[PDB]
Amino acid sequence: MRIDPFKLAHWMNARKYTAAQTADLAGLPLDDLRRLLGPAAATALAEALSVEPSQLAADAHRNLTVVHKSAEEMHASRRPIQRDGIHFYNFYTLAAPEGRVAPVVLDILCPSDRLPALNNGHLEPAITVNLGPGDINGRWGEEITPQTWRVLHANHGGDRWITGDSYVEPSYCPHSYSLAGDAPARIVSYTAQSNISPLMTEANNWSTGAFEEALKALSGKVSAGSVLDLFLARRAHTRTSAAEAAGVPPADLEAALRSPASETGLTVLRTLGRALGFDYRVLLPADDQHDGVGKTWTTIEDSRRSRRTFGTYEAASMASAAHLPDLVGSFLRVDDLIDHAENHYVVTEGRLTLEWDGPDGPASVELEPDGSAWTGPFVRHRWHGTGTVLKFGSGAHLGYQDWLELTNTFEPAATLRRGRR
Amino acid sequence: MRIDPFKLAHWMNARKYTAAQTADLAGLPLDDLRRLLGPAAATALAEALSVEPSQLAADAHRNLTVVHKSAEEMHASRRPIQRDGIHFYNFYTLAAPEGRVAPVVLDILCPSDRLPALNNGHLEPAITVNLGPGDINGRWGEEITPQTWRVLHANHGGDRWITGDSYVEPSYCPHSYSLAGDAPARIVSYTAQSNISPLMTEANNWSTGAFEEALKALSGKVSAGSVLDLFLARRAHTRTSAAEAAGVPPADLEAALRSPASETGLTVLRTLGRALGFDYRVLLPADDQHDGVGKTWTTIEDSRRSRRTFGTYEAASMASAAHLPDLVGSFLRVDDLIDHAENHYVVTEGRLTLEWDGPDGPASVELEPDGSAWTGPFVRHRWHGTGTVLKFGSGAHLGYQDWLELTNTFEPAATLRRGRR
Q1: What single DSSP character describes residue B164?
Q2: Residue A350: left (phi > 0), alpha (psi -120 to 50), or beta?
Q3: Cα–Cα distance for residue pair A415/A64, rounded to 1 Å
Q4: Read out DSSP for B78-126?
Q5: Secondary structure element (H or E) that encloses residue B42, with its range
Q6: DSSP assignment letter at A365
Q7: For B10-78, where are the E strands, in sequence order?
Q8: Which of A196, A199, A333, A397 would you mutate first to test chain B, the one with the most B CBs within 10 A?
Q9: Among B138, B145, B94, which residue's Cα sits nearest to residue B298?
Q10: Per DSSP, which regions of A126-259 are E strands?
Q11: Where, by residue number, does Fe cation bind (chains A, B)?
């Protein structure tokens, strides 16, 4: 229930109240406010600043660098889920900051002679990999067909650190799993945050008339021209005025919208961008979508083929997708690490040691199979010992969306520094 | 203090608790939960879901379409600000949803014979335009030089609806204004939300070691290669493994990083993107930054030159910037409107009528000079009468960042529809 000095300075600035005016309005001591900027109070500040208490509240957890969970504790979290009249899955949770979404390990208990009843799907996309040792069935449709029923294999060969096939569970499409045969099997399902969730959360609160107008604008093929027209209408420009505004021939502007990726088109849309004040990059094409799981599907052979040395590690790729840049999965063989976002790790073999440099100096924890850890963004760490660990990644900060704003910022490091002190 | 059905379904799904399990854990009636999904309770749900009450709280205001404020009320909000020992400005606020940041009108009271003492700057970038009738001085530096002292002119000619020069106040740089002479003058300063604020808010909570690591990564020239290396390290790939992974010659990958905008480079980075699972677009170059206000500066002549017909309106442009796509300003002459984001309007001449189609059917309000209104995203509206109104725009939803994720979504309209019902 603490106060965020950053959120407070922002609101005093917004309402342009001096420190003294803020204290006088809020009805509390000035040394306190000069301290907060550096319970019974928070309510007053909120009132004096015309904002809800949650708009000034600090984060539930500050200075988190690493969080870990032993094999014993992950096993202790086991929880059975009943579906279709039987013990369908066994629920386990991996390391994750308190309150956050934790990666999940699942026992696949639905026999091969019974179609696995589907769940209702979910917004977040997720990387799912078969830990083995048995093969499993993937179901993505009511009707059983090659497009909605496929075997997610377990590695039966020698390079076991590559545990099995993996793919990306598409956002919102129902799915379920069953055993492909007798051999038991476990699955690891890692979800990243939804990058469209913030928009949805807001759109859900708009009037229904506006919501329908938004859907209308998003309906159909969202081409470069359709997005551009919205940008122009946003600026009270027509395609004609915008063209003469950018000094471009209407004939070429039409071509570029037909070829955003051609160098002729990119030069035009960027020239438009500079003239009208917008970022041409979001106008560039992205690989169309498929709606099936055949595009992201990554077999054991794919992963084996992708093997490479990464520092003191040997790495292999899990399923990925160009339209889900913040979601990553990787097979790591062990015998410094620092990503621009969060990492979720789970050991699959050997007694490994994770070390990290945190607030209290160097630290470390020994983790055995099913043991796991979570690293915050930019937290330098490393793994020692001989074994295997799965490397997952997610996080909105800093996601590919932040990287787009960052390339648009003058001296980003300076901006961040100013915000922190 | 209500509950968000969307945030609740998300958390029950995350923790994968059935409706019954949720009710049993939360300790409340099941019909209630089946109702919320469709005070004393919210606390229980939060506890049972291992989340803070704010993580399930609905928006302070739902179904807002339009908010307006009369000339009399905006005049009634006048507030003097003392600086450098004198009455420096007069503070006025324009229409805005309760709790939100309201556009500001300022009387410039610092005489021409006194250097206007600077403020401490602010994170949000802002479009500032001179309402006139007198010219004013702009100060952007301690020392008075051509780069930090320039006259922001007021239109003294006939097309008064174009009120004067405008420019973009760069994020965080101190600034202030004084009169250029005897003639009085008012200014309108419109700020958009900061697109980097979310990242900052989070980075402020990271350990200092991680923060320093982040600054290090952002320091220097943030080129296509420097961002790519982070993407690769994120995926346990080196430039060598990534190349052979995308089936590209190391020699070409180096060229593309030297020419992201050339069609040869874009084809490579997109091929890399498809292979490694990332969005090549954020790798594309954006116009460098300047740090001065000479790039966005828009004179009266510029605006006059940009005049164009827009539906039943005559429009002229205010200052803009390619790196601030969500911030827009426009001069509108009156005698349907629907943007993909929020609008803030302020009348400068005539008694005008704003109509909108809201939750209760068609509505309308008559606004005179200094009167203002705010429209939510996608809210269809129009202006009737003969006069002039300033059109400002901001909002994160849906900003250019959302448009990047939207082009990456399969059936976005469908996704949003599912989230709402």
Answers
A1: B
A2: left
A3: 22
A4: -EEEEETTEEEEEEEE----TTSPPPEEEEE-S-TTS--------SS-E
A5: helix B40-48
A6: E
A7: 66-69
A8: A199
A9: B138
A10: 126-133, 136-139, 149-152, 166-169, 176-179, 185-191
A11: 122, 175
**Which residues in chain A have their C atom more than 2.5 Å from the N of the next written residue, marking a break after them?**
38, 335
Please provide the size of chain B in residues.
421
Alpha-carbon distance values, A272 to A60, A248, B224 (Å) = 44, 8, 22
Structural resolution in Å: 2.2
In angstroms, the CA B210 to CA A9 distance is: 23
Residue contact B211–A420, C-beta within 8 A: yes
- Which of B325, B341, B407 lies closest to A278 in CB terms? B325
The answer to whether A65 and A375 have CB atoms below 8 angstroms apart is yes
- Sheet containing A176-179, strands listed edge to edge, beginning at the edge strand earlier in sequence: A149-152, A136-139, A176-179
* Lookup: tokens for A340: 């621009």
At residue A13, the 3 state secondary structure works out as helix
Distances (CA, A) of B231 to B101, B112, B407: 36, 53, 20
Strands B352-358 and B381-384: antiparallel
Dist. CA A132–CA B48, nearest whole Å: 33
Judged by a CB distance cut-off of 8 A, whether residue B144 touches chain A is no
Give the three-state DSSP class for B150. Answer: strand
- Residue of B406, B417, B418 to mutate, interface with A, max A Cβ within 10 Å: B406
Side chain identity at residue B202, one-letter code: E
- Secondary structure (DSSP) of B243-275: HHHHT--HHHHHHHHH-TTSHHHHHHHHHHHHH
Q: Which domains does chain A have, with CATH numbers?
A: 1-62+396-421 (1.10.260.40), 63-74+291-395 (2.60.120.10), 75-198 (2.60.120.10), 199-290 (1.10.260.40)
Amino acid found at B282? V
- Count CB atoms within 10 A of the CB of residue A253: 22
Instruction: List residues bridging with B80 in a β-sheet.
Output: B90
Q: Is A324 on the interface with B (CB under 8 A)?
A: yes
Structure-determination technique: X-ray
| Integer angstrom CA distances of residue A124 from A194, A269, B128, B181 | 5, 32, 40, 59
